[PDB]
Every structure is written in C-alpha cells, then in structure tokens.
Amino acid sequence: RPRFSFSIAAREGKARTGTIEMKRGVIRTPAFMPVGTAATVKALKPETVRATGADIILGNTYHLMLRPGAERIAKLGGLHSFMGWDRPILTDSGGYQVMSLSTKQSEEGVTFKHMLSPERSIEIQHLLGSDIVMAFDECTPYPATPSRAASSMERSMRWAKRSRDAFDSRKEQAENAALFGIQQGSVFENLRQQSADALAEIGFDGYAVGGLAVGEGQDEMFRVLDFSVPMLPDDKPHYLMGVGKPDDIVGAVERGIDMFDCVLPTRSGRNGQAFTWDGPINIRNARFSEDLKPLDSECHCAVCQKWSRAYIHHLIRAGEILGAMLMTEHNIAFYQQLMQKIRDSISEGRFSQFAQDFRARYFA
Amino acid sequence: RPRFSFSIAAREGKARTGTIEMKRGVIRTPAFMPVGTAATVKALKPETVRATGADIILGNTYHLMLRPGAERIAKLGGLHSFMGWDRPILTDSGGYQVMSLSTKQSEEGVTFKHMLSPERSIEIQHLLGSDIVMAFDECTPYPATPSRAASSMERSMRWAKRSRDAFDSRKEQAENAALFGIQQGSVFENLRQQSADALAEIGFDGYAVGGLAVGEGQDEMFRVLDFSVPMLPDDKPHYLMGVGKPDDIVGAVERGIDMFDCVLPTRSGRNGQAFTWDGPINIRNARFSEDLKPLDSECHCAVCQKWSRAYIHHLIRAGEILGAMLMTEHNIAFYQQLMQKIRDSISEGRFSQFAQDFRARYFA
Numbered sequence: 001r002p003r004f005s006f007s008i009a010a011r012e013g014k015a016r017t018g019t020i021e022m023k024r025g026v027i028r029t030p031a032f033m034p035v036g037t038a039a040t041v042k043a044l045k046p047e048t049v050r051a052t053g054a055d056i057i058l059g060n061t062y063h064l065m066l067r068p069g070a071e072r073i074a075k076l077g078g079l080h081s082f083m084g085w086d087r088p089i090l091t092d093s094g095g096y097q098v099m100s101l102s103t104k105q106s107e108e109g110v111t112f113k114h115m116l117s118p119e120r121s122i123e124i125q126h127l128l129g130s131d132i133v134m135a136f137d138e139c140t141p142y143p144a145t146p147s148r149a150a151s152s153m154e155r156s157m158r159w160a161k162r163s164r165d166a167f168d169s170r171k172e173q174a175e176n177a178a179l180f181g182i183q184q185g186s187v188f189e190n191l192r193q194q195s196a197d198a199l200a201e202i203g204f205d206g207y208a209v210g211g212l213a214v215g216e217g218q219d220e221m222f223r224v225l226d227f228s229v230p231m232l233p234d235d236k237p238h239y240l241m242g243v244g245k246p247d248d249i250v251g252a253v254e255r256g257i258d259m260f261d262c263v264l265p266t267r268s269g270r271n272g273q274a275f276t277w278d279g280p281i282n283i284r285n286a287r288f289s290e291d292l293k294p295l296d297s298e299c300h301c302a303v304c305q306k307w308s309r310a311y312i313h314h315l316i317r318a319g320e321i322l323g324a325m326l327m328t329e330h331n332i333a334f335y336q337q338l339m340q341k342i343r344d345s346i347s348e349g350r351f352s353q354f355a356q357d358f359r360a361r362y363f364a
Numbered sequence: 365r366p367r368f369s370f371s372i373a374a375r376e377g378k379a380r381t382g383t384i385e386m387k388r389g390v391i392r393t394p395a396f397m398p399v400g401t402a403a404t405v406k407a408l409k410p411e412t413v414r415a416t417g418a419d420i421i422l423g424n425t426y427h428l429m430l431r432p433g434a435e436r437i438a439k440l441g442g443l444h445s446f447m448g449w450d451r452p453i454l455t456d457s458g459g460y461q462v463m464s465l466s467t468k469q470s471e472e473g474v475t476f477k478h479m480l481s482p483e484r485s486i487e488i489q490h491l492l493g494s495d496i497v498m499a500f501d502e503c504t505p506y507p508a509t510p511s512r513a514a515s516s517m518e519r520s521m522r523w524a525k526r527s528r529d530a531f532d533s534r535k536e537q538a539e540n541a542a543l544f545g546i547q548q549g550s551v552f553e554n555l556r557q558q559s560a561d562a563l564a565e566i567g568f569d570g571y572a573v574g575g576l577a578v579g580e581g582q583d584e585m586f587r588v589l590d591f592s593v594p595m596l597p598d599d600k601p602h603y604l605m606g607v608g609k610p611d612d613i614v615g616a617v618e619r620g621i622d623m624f625d626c627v628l629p630t631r632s633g634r635n636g637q638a639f640t641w642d643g644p645i646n647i648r649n650a651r652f653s654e655d656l657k658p659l660d661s662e663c664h665c666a667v668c669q670k671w672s673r674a675y676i677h678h679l680i681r682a683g684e685i686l687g688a689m690l691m692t693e694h695n696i697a698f699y700q701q702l703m704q705k706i707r708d709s710i711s712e713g714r715f716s717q718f719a720q721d722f723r724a725r726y727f728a
C-alpha cells in the first residue's frame with residue numbers, strides 16, 4: 001500500500017533489520033537483490049527467483065536502453081509485465097556500465113558508442129516502470145588523487161540534484177516509486193562527509209555507498225565503510241552497490257548496510273562455483289564425480305532436496321543448460337538463506353556470534 | 365504394477381489409441397518421448413518435462429556409456445535417481461550414434477573411437493536401469509542396394525536374437541523391464557517382411573520400425589510404412605524411431621505407429637523455432653519484436669500463459685538461457701498436446717477429420 005516506508009525492527013551495534021514496504025511488495029532487510037541483466041535473472045524463471053526468497057531484483061538499465069529500448073519496453077507494458085516479475089525492481093542508472101562496457105564525459109552527462117544524462121536516466125527508469133530509481137552518478141576510479149576524487153564527487157552531487165528534480169517532475173514516478181542517492185568521495189573521509197551532506201540536503205528515500213568494490217580489496221572497503229555509513233541518515237536504507245562475496249556481505253551488515261546486489265551467485269553458478277556454509281566449491285572438480293551429497297548439507301533449496309553433486313558435476317562438465325539452472329538456483333537460494341540468517345540473528349541480538357561462527361566455518 | 369501390458373482402447377483405420385502399463389508408470393499411446401541426451405532433457409527439469417504431459421522419455425545411451433559411464437551411473441543408483449525422473453525411460457542401444465558420432469564393423473559388433481555388441485548394449489541398458497530396452501541393431505544407410513540392405517538386415521536379425529538372449533539371462537531385467545526389436549530392410553517390401561517374420565519368431569514386447577528418417581523424405585517414408593507396419597504383430601506397440609515433425613507424426617499414426625521420439629522440439633526450441641497450430645515460427649524474426657501474443661494462441665502450456673512472443677524474441681536474440689528454457693518447454697508441451705489431440709480423436713472416432721483439419725491449418 002505505501003509508496004515507500006522503511007521500518008527498523010531491531011538493531012545490534014551498527015547492524016539493522018527491518019522492512020521496506022512498497023506498492024508491489026515488502027522487502028526484508030538486510031536484503032540481497034539478484035541481478036537481472038537483460039530483463040532476466042540468468043537461467044531462472046521469476047517464480048524460481050521468488051521461491052529462493054528474493055523480495056526484489058535489480059534490473060540493469062544499460063543493456064535494456066539499447067535493446068529492446070526503454071520506449072519499446074514501455075509500449076509492451078513495462079519491465080514487470082515484460083519479464084513476469086510483479087514485485088519491486090530496483091533499476092540502476094545505466095551510467096556505471098557505460099563506463100565499463102562502451103565515451104565522452106561532460107557536465108551534461110556521458111556520450112557513448114547515445115547521450116546519457118541525469119534527466120535521460122530518470123526518464124528511462126520511468127519508462128521501465130522501476131520501483132526504486134537510482135540517481136545518475138559517476139563511479140570514481142580507484143585509486144584516485146584527492147583532487148580528482150573531489151571534482152568527481154562534486155559532479156556526482158550536481159547530478160544527484162538533477163536526478164531529484166527530474167524524478168519529482170514526473171508525477172506518476174514521484175507517487176509510485178522511490179529515489180536513492182549515491183555517496184561518492186573515493187577513500188577520503190572528508191569527501192565522503194561532503195558527499196553525505198550534499199545528499200541529505202537534497203533528500204532521498206535511501207542512500208547508496210558508491211565508489212567501492214572497484215579493486216580496493218575488502219580491508220580497504222571495510223575501512224571506508226567504517227566512517228562512511230554513519231554519515232548517512234540513520235532512518236533511511238543504506239545500499240552497498242555491487243557487493244559481494246558472502247563474507248563481504250556479513251562485514252558490510254556489521255557496518256550498517258541494509259541492501260546488496262551482485263552478479264556473483266548467478267555468474268559463479270554458470271561457471272561451476274557453488275556456495276556452501278563450508279566455503280565455495282568448484283563442482284567441476286573430479287572429487288565430486290561420485291559424490292551423492294547435495295551441493296550443501298544444510299541448504300533448504302529445491303536443488304539440494306533433489307539432485308546430487310555427482311549429477312550437477314556431470315551437467316556442468318557436459319555444458320548442459322540444466323547445470324547452469326541448478327547451480328544458479330542453489331547459489332541464489334544460498335544467498336537468500338544467508339540474508340535470512342543475518343535478519344534472524346540481528347532480530348535475536350546474536351548477530352555478532354553469527355558473524356564469528358559463519359566466518360570460522362566458511363574459512364575453515 | 366505390471367512389468368509391461370499394452371491395451372488398445374480404440375481404433376480408427378490403422379490408428380490405435382491405448383495404454384502401456386509398466387512398473388514406473390502408465391504410457392498413453394500414441395506417445396511422444398522427449399529425448400534426454402546426456403541424462404537431461406535439454407533445458408528442462410524433470411518436473412517440467414512431466415508438467416508438459418510426457419509419460420516416458422528416451423535416454424540416449426551412447427553419450428552416457430562414455431561419460432559418466434554405465435557402471436558409474438549404476439553405482440550412483442541408476443539413471444532414474446541420477447537425473448530425477450522416476451517414470452519410464454526407454455533407452456536406445458547406443459549403436460545408432462556410434463555410426464553417426466564416432467568405426468570397425470564385424471559380426472561380433474562395432475569397434476569405435478571401445479567395442480559395442482548386442483550383449484554389451486543390453487548390459488549397459490541394464491546398468492542404467494532402463495524400463496524399455498532396445499535391441500542392438502544396424503541402421504542401414506539410405507539408399508542401399510537390395511543385396512546390401514539384405515545382408516545388413518540379416519545381421520540385425522542375428523543381433524536381435526543375441527539381444528533377446530542377453531536380456532532374458534538377466535533375471536532382474538527380464539522381470540522389471542521390456543525389450544523391443546527393430547525391423548530393418550530399407551525400402552524393400554520383401555526384406556521388411558523377412559525382418560518382421562524373424563522378429564516375431566524371436567518375440568518382443570514391442571516392435572520398432574528402423575531404417576527410416578534417414579534422408580528418404582516423407583513420401584517415401586510413408587510408402588514404406590504403408591506396407592511395413594501391418595507386418596508387425598498387431599497386439600504389440602509399434603515404435604517409429606527418430607520421427608519427427610508434427611505432420612510426420614500424424615501421418616505415421618494414420619499408418620499404425622504408437623510411439624515416437626525426436627530431438628526436434630528441444631533442438632528447434634534452442635534455435636528459435638516454435639511450433640504452433642498454424643505451423644512453425646522463428647521467434648528471432650523482427651516481426652515478433654512487439655508481438656504481445658503468446659507463442660501459440662491455443663496452447664495450454666505455462667509459457668503461453670505468462671510470456672509474450674516479444675519477450676521470448678528478446679531472450680533468444682540476447683542468447684539468454686531463459687529463452688532456451690521457455691522455447692523448449694513450449695515445444696515439448698505443443699508436442700504433448702498434439703499427442704493428446706491424436707489420442708482423443710482416435711478414441712472418439714474422428715481422427716481422420718482431425719488429421720485433415722490439422723494439415724489444412726498447419727500448412728495454410
């Protein structure tokens with residue numbers, strides 16, 4: 001019923017658990033968003049994505065704005081109808097992948113081989129029918145000089161204001177969707193503070209920590225999160241973009257993050273990597289050829305209820321589509337079970353113990 | 365409950381409809397068997413294969429005997445457990461693909477780059493836990509001289525007797541599975557008769573028409589079926605190997621065939637060809653880019669209940685796994701709906717009219 005309502009039900013240290021209520025559904029936080037690259041979570045029907053426990057998916061905009069195109073998807077009834085996912089979708093701005101997959105940069109926006117600006121990005125996300133819209137920003141490369149990081153962040157803040165204005169100008173979008181801003185500033189505490197101040201001044205429904213998971217490594221990422229997350233408004237969701245491995249997620253939650261997206265469970269799945277409570281395994285390895293156990297001994301997913309490591313080993317080695325399907329369903333389910341354990345442990349005031357127990361076993 | 369019981373419930377001309385009862389399930393005839401190439405019906409979970417209406421699948425033996433190997437599959441609990449399909453499986457002998465995918469031929473069997481003989485084939489199928497076992501034969505190439513066809517057929521008949529003996533020697537196989545013989549003789553009526561006589565003398569649970577769908581074309585295939593099928597025992601199932609397109613199936617049923625297998629619905633599915641009552645379409649074609657209709661307007665499958673041509677067009681053009689999944693599920697469901705319409709129309713004594721109506725619309 002509500003457009004966007006974030007409620008925090010429980011806390012432990014910097015960690016929070018709660019819910020975001022939106023018109024298309026409730027999102028339990030901390031949340032993991034499976035990534036839909038070109039209007040599909042690779043190798044999964046939407047009903048299967050939901051069966052794993054996902055409340056919301058991320059829709060990449062960059063590919064969709066090229067093919068089939070945002071106007072075409074709108075003509076076909078919007079992204080939800082098009083792909084058959086009726087729950088919330090968070091769309092990215094399209095700019096991150098422009099820089100990584102295409103470019104000419106200016107104050108207006110980015111030209112690439114088309115022009116993408118804050119205004120055009122917001123309109124594209126509107127045409128897709130996004131529930132959570134990301135402001136159009138610039139992900140500062142790493143490493144960056146303080147001066148380069150500063151000028152980059154400042155441009156992102158101007159683009160954040162333009163994103164806000166474009167979103168607010170579209171009545172139907174403002175009434176039915178939410179808008180998140182993205183903090184920049186590289187690894188520099190003062191710039192992160194200036195960025196947080198600028199975003200709070202403008203005002204958003206949620207705040208992402210941008211500019212991380214770009215090669216800096218976990219120690220440095222955690223160091224930056226240590227000071228950066230407390231700068232954001234406490235009463236709104238905190239979203240860490242493009243993170244990450246299970247241990248990255250646990251540590252980020254310990255530091256105040258409420259939302260995550262990553263291609264790892266899907267991409268790894270197709271490549272033969274399965275996540276387990278005892279760490280990742282490569283199912284192609286010969287040691288699994290006669291292993292009748294499920295991928296993970298505790299996992300509640302449909303794959304682990306029915307098929308053996310030996311069978312999935314065979315499928316992946318044979319290049320069979322079903323191999324990709326089963327690995328992906330399991331990995332996404334594993335990620336959702338991780339999030340559920342995180343939510344329950346915070347709710348119960350035993351998250352610290354969970355984090356310690358998780359790491360001891362995962363890295364044994 | 366029974367090992368193998370074929371009952372004919374209704375007839376119209378040469379067409380029959382009925383059931384084969386086996387320990388793992390009932391098979392409604394005329395039946396279409398989706399093909400499982402390497403212990404998977406490509407891009408489908410077994411539950412989805414069943415949801416389309418399939419009563420039985422065909423398991424290719426050739427690939428499995430190489431990897432993971434028949435002894436390994438037996439150690440892992442058999443093919444049914446391995447792949448998660450608990451209903452009947454018909455296994456081929458492995459010899460057809462040896463000739464088409466690998467060879468040295470002799471009276472003992474075939475050597476290839478391993479030796480495959482009637483005895484080894486039967487043992488492999490036993491290790492897999494097959495419900496319907498195919499005799500090991502030789503598919504005569506087309507065209508063939510009468511003398512070459514004759515010597516080839518005669519060798520197949522000797523191999524059929526050896527297959528029978530090997531099957532009967534394995535108590536557990538003889539008690540729980542069925543054995544089909546394969547008629548040869550190329551396009552020659554006298555040789556087809558000699559082959560049928562030899563097979564009936566030995567005695568099988570079912571009889572396949574071999575040596576067809578090997579380049580002869582539909583007119584010639586139908587011509588050979590016209591005289592060949594009546595030579596087989598009327599009271600046992602008739603199985604046409606490797607057929608075929610929807611119109612091939614309808615015409616073969618008109619000529620007395622009860623069982624079919626073909627890679628077309630699965631293989632075509634992955635390649636972008638969808639079967640419809642108005643003929644096949646290629647979903648990649650630009651004309652489908654904004655088409656909100658389902659693949660077929662009447663189809664009862666889950667794919668046609670939920671997704672548009674436009675979406676599947678997008679998926680297939682993007683090389684997305686979900687595209688292969690949806691196309692394959694629809695095509696297999698379409699084939700099963702065809703078989704259901706065939707069964708109902710024969711039961712109701714209106715199959716002739718159905719065949720005419722089907723062809724008029726399919727080829728309009």
Ligand SMILES: O=c1[nH]cnc2cc3nc(NCCN4CCOCC4)[nH]c3cc12
Nearest residue numbers: 096137139210211212213214241242264
């Ligand atoms: O500042 C950002 N602004 C807008 N989008 C982003 C997306 C981002 N994605 C990553 N990292 C992705 C890490 N992946 C891990 C798996 O393999 C692919 C890379 N960092 C990101 C930062 C930003």
Ligand SMILES: O=c1[nH]cnc2cc3nc(NCCN4CCOCC4)[nH]c3cc12
Nearest residue numbers: 460501503574575576577578605606628
């Ligand atoms: O005498 C036979 N003996 C044992 N196995 C067979 C398998 C057979 N498979 C075909 N034809 C297959 C036709 N396919 C159509 C679809 O594209 C691939 C070929 N004909 C066949 C004949 C025999």
Ligand SMILES: [Zn+2]
Nearest residue numbers: 299301304330
């Ligand atoms: Zn699992």
Ligand SMILES: [Zn+2]
Nearest residue numbers: 663665668694
């Ligand atoms: Zn359909």
